[PDB]
Ligand binder design. Structure first.
Ligand SMILES: CO[C@H]1O[C@@H](C)[C@@H](O)[C@@H](O)[C@@H]1O
Ligand SMILES: CO[C@H]1O[C@@H](C)[C@@H](O)[C@@H](O)[C@@H]1O
Ligand SMILES: CO[C@H]1O[C@@H](C)[C@@H](O)[C@@H](O)[C@@H]1O
Ligand SMILES: CO[C@H]1O[C@@H](C)[C@@H](O)[C@@H](O)[C@@H]1O
Ligand SMILES: CO[C@H]1O[C@@H](C)[C@@H](O)[C@@H](O)[C@@H]1O
Ligand SMILES: CO[C@H]1O[C@@H](C)[C@@H](O)[C@@H](O)[C@@H]1O
Ligand SMILES: [Ca+2]
Lengths: 314, 314
């Protein structure tokens, strides 16, 4: 290993955001501190000088952004409430408003977060698991945090993926979230602006490891059209990818890359097929320097490639 | 799942102690507390009322005993020192003195612990990983806790298994310990009353997942004779067993039972091949009610069977 690598928690929560190919990746160090590693041309940071906050050891770590102007990072306090580390361009990092609502969740709750697409307003939808094991939406729409829709039961400790997009032939944002049911399927729930929440859960994978990590992204929103990608850790100890392409629907899955048993996963994307895209970046642990975070890359030039062997501070 | 199962930490550290078929199991709950579950003809406890202490979330949990008269449970504090919860008959549960020494270990250390075999005196050896990634022994022999032998480099965050037996043709205890080296190998180091620690690393398995759970037992000490079992979580997500049998040395290995990705493991034993045993019991997570601990059993009557499916408080 290396001294940097050793600072990184084994099975740390992982999250990432970006503006095109400007990248931020958050993880937890062995002491519980949440750090940010950074890529602008080259990889950097991720040290103890790069701490944005502290959270319970073993915390889930989620993030979403509007480019790199507005960033938000979600984790649990020791007392198992939802908190929020916020970055605003021209202000720097501070302690978000989420924490004051004291939203109490299961100790094993995971967390997903999205800024709603197609608006310049700041509209956040955060998802986590209550003590009754239901999935619960929390909204921020410019007058304070509140509970949104309850999307009902799931496997205790389930992974949670989420994404927002805006169809161009609609005048509101859509949302998809993914999670695990008691029978260990992975399913999607779905919100659209005319329909509201559809009542149905739609299987995307028949049987996955319990509490397996789930992460999602979307690109190329058009007219009733979208391209989605959901990733999870499978029984073979590799990340699997599951594709939605418009018209085909949920039409393929397969393996992508090897990970350590119980790795978390973060996904980001930019561009679309129209403009020599998309680009995809996946983050996870695969044993590099034992405990380092690693990167997998998809692009048009070279397709499916391992990226940065080990992220800062490794 | 069950409101009881949901209380056990996923990938919790696990230790076990016994006198014959009188069993204690220790584990961590989602809040950080170390809880005891018990088997006296039937299985009980493991509730919020059965808490012997707190530890850093994610802590290793190791345990050793002199039958059930003296029990010692070793974990790490939030500040990464070795700590100890003590039970002596007639006294109850207390914090032992190990905490007092403020032995700092790598945040990612595991722990192994043994009482030396074949003396009524309480003689304790703990093994942990120091921040320089060597395995350090710590001793208690009635005169306060101190450093013992240092045992060389190991993979940052190796599992450590330990056992102590006494050959009857000898005047004191033998020790064996097991851990993982940077090359991913699994190795044995050995101590013997007539030669001290042998210099040499013996390989017991060529390549295991990094930081795999390792746990170990011995039974049937006679004249220059012993039996030993070592257990680990292999790349196929099952506990594998490595077999030392008197006359053959190390000579067999294979799979035993499936476990969840990154499960910890504890092993206890009693009896012998000459008095109609031995008896073995593994504890681990295989996914029963998601997060419950399960058990596996070997006896002469029925050999290999799963046992208590979900341990209390499940
Ligand atoms: C072209 O691949 C590169 O894309 C960058 C945005 C960043 O992810 C780098 O680590 C990759 O090697
Ligand atoms: C240039 O790096 C900065 O980018 C911002 C968008 C945010 O990630 C900050 O934490 C970094 O220091
Ligand atoms: C305005 O609140 C609504 O926003 C939608 C986008 C969706 O999150 C619904 O659950 C909320 O009730
Ligand atoms: C025969 O197996 C039993 O042995 C007991 C001592 C204990 O390990 C139980 O959980 C098993 O069912
Ligand atoms: C009789 O039950 C007790 O057994 C002791 C050996 C110790 O494990 C205590 O924690 C239990 O309450
Ligand atoms: C008395 O100290 C010794 O005890 C032995 C049994 C063994 O643990 C050695 O490491 C120590 O130097
Ligand atoms: Ca740039």
């Amino acid at each position: 290993s290396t001294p940097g690598a050793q600072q990184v928690l084994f099975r740390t929560g992982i999250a990432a955001v970006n503006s095109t190919n400007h990248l931020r990746v958050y993880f937890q160090d062995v002491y519980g501190s949440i750090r940010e590693s950074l890529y602008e041309g080259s990889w950097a940071n991720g040290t103890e000088k790069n701490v944005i906050g502290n959270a319970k050891l073993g915390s889930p770590v989620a993030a979403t952004s509007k480019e790199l102007k507005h960033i938000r990072v979600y984790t649990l306090t020791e007392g198992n409430t939802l908190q929020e580390f916020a970055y605003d361009s021209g202000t720097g990092w501070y302690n978000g408003g989420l924490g004051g609502a004291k939203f109490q969740v299961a100790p094993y709750s995971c967390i997903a977060a999205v800024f709603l697409a197609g608006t310049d307003a700041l509209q956040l939808r955060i998802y986590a698991q209550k003590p009754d094991n239901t999935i619960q939406e929390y909204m921020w729409n410019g007058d304070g945090w509140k509970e949104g829709t309850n999307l009902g039961g799931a496997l205790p400790g389930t992974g949670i993926g989420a994404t927002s997009f805006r169809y161009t032939d609609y005048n509101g944002p859509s949302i998809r979230i993914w999670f695990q049911t008691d029978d260990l399927k992975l399913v999607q729930r779905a919100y659209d602006p005319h329909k509201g929440w559809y009542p149905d859960l739609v299987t995307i994978f028949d049987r996955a490891p319990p509490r397996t990590a789930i992460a999602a992204t979307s690109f190329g929103a058009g007219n009733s059209s979208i391209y989605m990608r959901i990733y999870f850790v499978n029984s073979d100890n590799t990340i699997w990818q599951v594709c939605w392409d418009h018209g085909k629907g949920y039409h393929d899955k397969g393996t992508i890359t090897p990970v350590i048993q119980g790795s978390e996963v973060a996904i980001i994307s930019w561009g679309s097929f129209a403009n020599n895209g998309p680009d995809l970046r996946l983050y996870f642990q695969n044993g590099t320097y034992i405990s380092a975070v690693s990167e997998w890359v998809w692009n048009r030039a070279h397709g499916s490639q391992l990226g940065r062997s080990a992220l800062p501070p490794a």
